[model samples]
Target: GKSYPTVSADYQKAVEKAKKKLRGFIAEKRCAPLMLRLAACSAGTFDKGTKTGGPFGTIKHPAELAHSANNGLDIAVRLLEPLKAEFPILSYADFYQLAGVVAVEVTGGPEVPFHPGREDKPEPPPEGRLPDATKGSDHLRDVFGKAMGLTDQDIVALSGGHTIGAAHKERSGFEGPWTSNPLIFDNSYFTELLSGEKEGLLQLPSDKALLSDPVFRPLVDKYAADEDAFFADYAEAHQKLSELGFADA
Candidate 1:
């Protein structure tokens, strides 16, 4: 039932060190090319030095969506191609998910629980599984919930990811980063929601819908009002998110 081979103790040690070095590099550079490489690996469409442009252009279907700003994940992948050659055992799927794990850790967030065994699927998960920025609370729940089998609370906690990255005008058709401090992982995402200052902050029509939805509103309100709730839920949700298709640990 496992998707990857069990990692040896030596490999774990090496990965731990690699994780540390990778984190240090990420701190030095805002772009974090290694993380991008892992992203490309996850998608599995790009090749090294082939100059095929980026994942934006490479994704077969949903061409329109691929060109969106939020979808500009190809940039991350293309930048990380060289690393792939160096670490052949680390497939794109494992690399991408692990990068997310490292991103949280290096930035001083919760310990993302994960195991390394995600084998690359011949194809990416069918598109449209990712949340639609234009939809409201119910839509967000449906999309993300289906992707990782999460509940409403889990969906809201994961949306805190919006806390770090900005919506790209070209990528997601939205503008501005979720929080001023996109690079640093912190509780600011929930704090801002609780701050009661919701003007000019640029909530996509879908994001604004959470305020009115009966089921989602309560969870949103809880996250907005209490930092502990957000953290606890996020910790659980993030750990689950990282495991996606991997076998049980």
Candidate 2:
């Protein structure tokens, strides 16, 4: 009963090309190589004939998303619009997740194993899929983990995304980026948490709660102290995120 869109061959080819380009860019050490690549990829579609690009476009600048924190991620939709013409086979869901894969690899992150073939929903899923920064660690876990079917460790690994981006004051009412180098992908996110240097890191109240909460703090501490563990966890989480709806692939 539910209608959905399927990916075309051309779209799959384009995605493959985009992934290669992203890999090359990462090799060059471009600014926030992984993050930028992901931003561009995720921002793949845009509403036809619109000037405002979508969430993917705005993601390039945390200030924009931050300004509207907790708001719907329309920018991502807008960014993916153009790709519709270029790669009709590609679905928004696939593009968004694929972008994350490209971004991670470009940023010196572990390779996210993936297979394509995701179909888009006839309509975008309702807006509340993204987590609320105001909620506690438990709430964050319930919302994000359920949406993606991720585990507690998976949630923590994905949150490492904070290492290369910041919380926007306008978007989430939080200020400053997460890491000194918001563009680079490294274990610094985990390292910073354990260093006792979180004075002005622009963390959401919820994230701070995650750090102190008895249930969540241990994971954070482990990730912060061990680069190998963080990388391994991130690889597994990224793979799982990429595999959603990819049963055929």
Candidate 3:
């Protein structure tokens, strides 16, 4: 029951400013992976049943920041601290979500939709809502499919997000890139998955489930065959992910 806030010129300027700074972070710090991680981790907490979580800026609270699932995300938020001070009107919920959006675009992924004006919430959602990387397809279906109301296609497309990041043993206990490039956003993740296991890449039980599960497997093949299809589906699915609980369902 919240009315959508208008996207004004001033708001767009703040987004542009933030985007420029984020692009700089990518260029100078090579932190797009962390930025994307911040965005996903922030939004991935959404629980559709209660409608109390999602991208409400609560990730900054000490309680949520300290969650085990959110380990190492502190660095990404710290990078945005100055930007937060600079654009006070851009809600942390909106800013963090937008950070993920920009992270995808600057790295050659499709342009995901972004709407600002999400109000900040001081209280964080309870921990243990995010998906577990160590688990398999059923767990993934429970977290994203059942709880989040996403489809099998959405699950596969969104998993493409791993195309840009590496798993750090110090953080997630996994220790390799999902793709060989690890920075470029593309369907190479699916292709790489189909090509069988490689030495330097990491595929969690959850990731491998995409190929093993009957429902999710074909969608994986579809995306791997067509990059544009992956980009389009990913853009829409990610937008949906970004908007969960923040807007009317």
Candidate 4:
């Protein structure tokens, strides 16, 4: 714990720069306030049940870097170039994980932890290693359930991250927010995710699956009725997520 390479004292400045850019992406006339965690989670989770694929910043591997989660080599490369230059001592993995946390905190979510020391790699992960957003309950179970060994409750709480940001048509081909107030973080996503089903609003296939997956639906309901519960669970689950595929884990 005491031996890892620190994130460089200059990280705060990078955070400030990135935060401004993030606000532009999340706020303003347009941005990915909603897309940050999703993409970050995607990149983070690709390792899921695997021994090698966790967030160790491997998303920068040329192949994995091309995934929509990383927003393609070109886009990530642009941001990473400057970020890397500023924090040469840190790995892209550190920055990637930090981006997710800062994105959430920027949107009013819980203060999830950030521990750096992950080393980087040049090789990309195998193709088709990530989850498909269009899939339903069984797929979710297979991915988060059997893979990560996460409980049904954990999966539902993780979904609460859908709370902020907008869906990009190019990314998921599905568009729209889970709640009316996509800028702020709250249990409203859990609430809207449920009510929207009854009212016939658009939802991701996995979002709809929450109601059908008996175990997951109840957890969703639990979060819907209680914001504090959602925050508690989300933090726990996010930690589990950020730790996926670590060498020592």
Candidate 5:
């Protein structure tokens, strides 16, 4: 009913079982589920017109596995291994797209629409398929902006992801949580970004640029006060984000 692709019925029970378990997992970790979600999204959504990106098993592929930050994915994927072992019918690709939705919803995040026909790749496209976190807002505009002709609203709403998590020191040189309560999914990210309240909290220069950039700033400002609006907008952007690198299977 949600326009999401479903696992073939042969393993439908297995899929549902895994979703329930992952939901419990999200309820438990608080912070780590976000990282796992990013790994699922990053390696999966780098779609470049069928030349790259998808819900494929790229995160499980060797290139990404080589990175220490990416190596954490091994742990993430292992959480779902019970299903893989049980069904032997599902795939790492399906686990990726499916796991992210579970993490998002159980964490008070919006329900991102999901589709499940992804086919895993034998090798990763390249190490940098994910947007470089080190880049600027201008880079986000040109880089993620044109990724799918996403709007300034979509781009800004997408950036609200930072509102919920901190930058990992091991993954990037950046440190600290962007919000006081990184565990919750609320507009506090926008609230903190607009004023000096989050002074001690960490933010990327790029995060600040969303407030300064003419194009993306407005939505950021709007989300500060209207979290419901942010939720509605973010759901759509997340659908776009979830389908970022997806191509028809």
Candidate 6:
């Protein structure tokens, strides 16, 4: 019996304006990584059985922002605060995900489709729903698969987002970029993963599992050899990520 809002002309205009603000912010601050992290953190908390959390703007709640896994995301939210005020009708949920979509495209990634109907349910989910970086593929399955109904291919495809970001020791106790050009959204993450010598790059146990896990290795191989394939799968999977908890809407 729950209904979500529609994307109105006014909303579209507001979105354009918000896009300008986001583009300016990313250019000036070069915080595309943080923006992508913000989008993922906001939605990654979804628990299907409880039907709670997700890209419902719940991430802006202080309690949720305070989660250890969500560290450094506050900066991204703060940057978007003014835009949120400037456009009152666009849900923070939509704006947050849209900012992420822009983050990818601005960094030369594929165009991710975004749906803007999520209601602002600013309640935080219980903590510990996100996957841990220190863990492996089994843990990933529990978090992204069992918890969010994602597949191994979805896991590998979504991991491509790391193509743009670095792991900050201060945030996750991990230290280094995933690829040589941390700002570029390319399949280099996959290539780097396959390389025998990953000198300065960071590969968390979770990341390494992609190669060690039989079900996942082939997808990684395919994506590493094909940029277009990674982009196509990433676009679809990222769009699916944006719709995690609001399937009915």
Top lDDT prediction, candidate number: 6
Can you give the lDDT of residue 129 in candidate 6?
96
How are the candidates ranked when ordered by lDDT, highest leading? 6, 3, 5, 4, 2, 1
Per residue, candidate 2 scores C-alpha lDDT tens digits across 1-249 of: 112345567766878976675466444544343343344223222222231122222342343333333232344444545544455555555556666676676667777765555544333223344566777777766654544455787777777867776655554467776677766677787667656556666566666766776756788888877877888988886665555434511
TM-scores across all candidates?
A: 0.76, 0.70, 0.95, 0.80, 0.84, 0.95
Q: State the weakest 10-residue window (summed lDDT) of model 6.
A: 1-10
Better of 1 and 6 by lDDT: 6
- Please identify model 4 stretches exceeding 4 Å from their true place: 1-35, 38-50, 68-77, 197-201
Q: Which candidate would rank higher by lDDT, 3 or 4?
A: 3
* lDDT of candidates 1 onward, in order: 0.56, 0.56, 0.85, 0.65, 0.67, 0.87
lDDT-superior candidate, 2 or 4: 4
Worst lDDT window (10 residues) for model 2?
Answer: 43-52
Off by over 4 Å in 2: 1-13, 23-85, 196-200, 245-249
Query: Per-residue alpha-carbon lDDT of model 5 for 1-249, expressed as tens digits?
Result: 134555577667767777787777667756344544554445434644554665566776556766644635655665655645664666677667677777667768887776555666676655554455656776776656554446778878877877666766766667788888777777888888888535569877777778778877778878998999999998887766666555432
lDDT of 1 by residue, 18-117 (tens): 5665566566666542353233223322222331222222332244225433266656655445554456665555656666677666666667676665
- lDDT of predicted model 5: 0.67
The parts of candidate 5 lying over 4 Å away from their true place are 1-7, 39-45, 67-72, 82-84, 197-199, 245-249
User: What is the lDDT for 37 in model 3?
Assistant: 85
lDDT, candidate 3, 1-249, per-residue tens:
434668889898988888787777665677788888888788777777887778888888878889998888888888789867888868888888888888898888998988787888877888888999888889988888777777778889999999998989998888889898888999999998888889988888888889889989989989999999999999989988888777674
Backbone clash tally for model 5? Answer: 2
